[PDB]
Point group: C3
Chain length 88, copies 3
């Protein structure tokens, strides 16, 4: 089936749910006023996520895997880019 990963922050809360579906990962977002589609859209058959909230900043790391290759995607307030994570 499709595979999901979820994270949340604050007291509203904000929630992000990532779904790997047919080789593509997309993102659904809740910030207290309805679900919507987020900016994250990257290839992958499997996804995990962690996040940490510091002051006014959310930091999100999404680990997207295809075959044996895992790419880390980073949100630090200014869009998604690949992070330095490698498998070894």
């Amino acid at each position: 089936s499709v595979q999901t990963a979820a994270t949340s922050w604050g007291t509203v809360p904000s929630i992000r749910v990532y779904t790997a579906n047919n080789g593509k990962i997309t993102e659904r977002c809740w910030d207290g006023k309805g679900w919507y589609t987020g900016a994250f859209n990257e290839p992958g058959d499997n996804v995990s996520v962690t996040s940490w909230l510091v002051g006014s900043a959310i930091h999100i790391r999404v680990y997207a895997s295809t075959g044996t290759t895992t790419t880390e995607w980073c949100w630090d307030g200014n869009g998604w880019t690949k992070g330095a994570y490698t498998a070894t």
Copy 2:
């Protein structure tokens, strides 16, 4: 194999582990005095979870997927019910 998702809260801690096994998701609970089977029992081949603790209340969201359909299940102090989450 079976697929799991885990969350925890507080300092005891309380832990919840969800297992998707043969199309069914069940829940195991730890609150500091042994593991036991929780109330959550719903269909699904894949599961993710997030939770947030506010004051005296734990809020849990479990994302259960079968095929391309994902159902959000909500714990907000009074049993599990379906939440408003949709895939798009």
Copy 3:
């Protein structure tokens, strides 16, 4: 594909990413100064993780599944050992 699970703590942060790959789970670690391979290495086709930081101590629980058997692995400051978790 390979399957991952991730957790993080503090403000640096520390991040741990577990990868189930070809029946083996390994661990990659970030503590603010580069990624490295952690001590965790155990069998499994699926992995989930949760952690909680209390005072100066991180507690990590990794749920490793092969077939219908799930083993809980515990980090409480002194290496990884099997925990009391059972499926029922």
